[PDB]
């Protein structure tokens, strides 16, 4: 306050701000790869579903949508990238 660095703000208090109020705006949502050991391969899912995503071959389930990040179904794993 009264003097500070607006060009190099702390990574802690940039982390709490709204995605549009950061210094250069960008998304907070991520993509993930999901598996359900019935199936060998892995679909890539957006963290925020809308559509309830079904896997490659079998109609199973993956996530139901929410007002937000999708709840993943039951036994599943995920990596992030």
């Amino acid at each position: 306050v009264l003097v500070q660095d607006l060009l190099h703000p702390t990574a802690a208090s940039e982390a709490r701000k709204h995605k549009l109020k950061t210094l250069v705006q960008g998304p907070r949502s991520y993509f993930l790869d999901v598996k359900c050991p019935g199936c060998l391969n892995i679909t890539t899912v957006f963290s925020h579903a809308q559509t309830a995503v079904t896997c490659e071959s079998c109609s199973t389930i993956l996530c139901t949508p929410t007002g937000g990040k999708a709840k993943l179904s039951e036994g599943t794993s995920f990596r992030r990238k």
Binding site: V1, L2, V3, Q4, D5, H8, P9, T10, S13
Partner: protein
């Protein structure tokens, strides 16, 4: 404030606030001058030697006199950390 040929006219060049570079003028009686004396080997605060700062009554009223003093002193080297340029 010079004149036609060279001569300094217009009495009394005022002080300036150390934080804001804004004039401190006669009737500001909320202003301040903080005298910080220099030290020497093994204690010993050395009378008659100072590093001085002048803070306008504006800044003091706005509650910034403290945090603004840290930046000022630490940049002159009489504080080590306490102040962070980033937030």
């Amino acid at each position: 404030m010079e004149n036609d040929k060279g001569q300094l006219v217009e009495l009394y060049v005022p002080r300036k606030c150390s934080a804001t570079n804004r004039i401190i003028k006669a009737d500001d009686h909320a202003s301040v001058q903080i005298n910080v004396a220099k030290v020497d080997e093994e204690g010993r605060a050395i009378p008659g030697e100072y590093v001085t700062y002048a803070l306008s009554g504006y800044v003091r009223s706005r509650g910034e006199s403290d945090d603004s003093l840290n930046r000022l002193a630490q940049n002159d080297g009489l504080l080590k950390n306490v102040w962070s340029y980033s937030r």
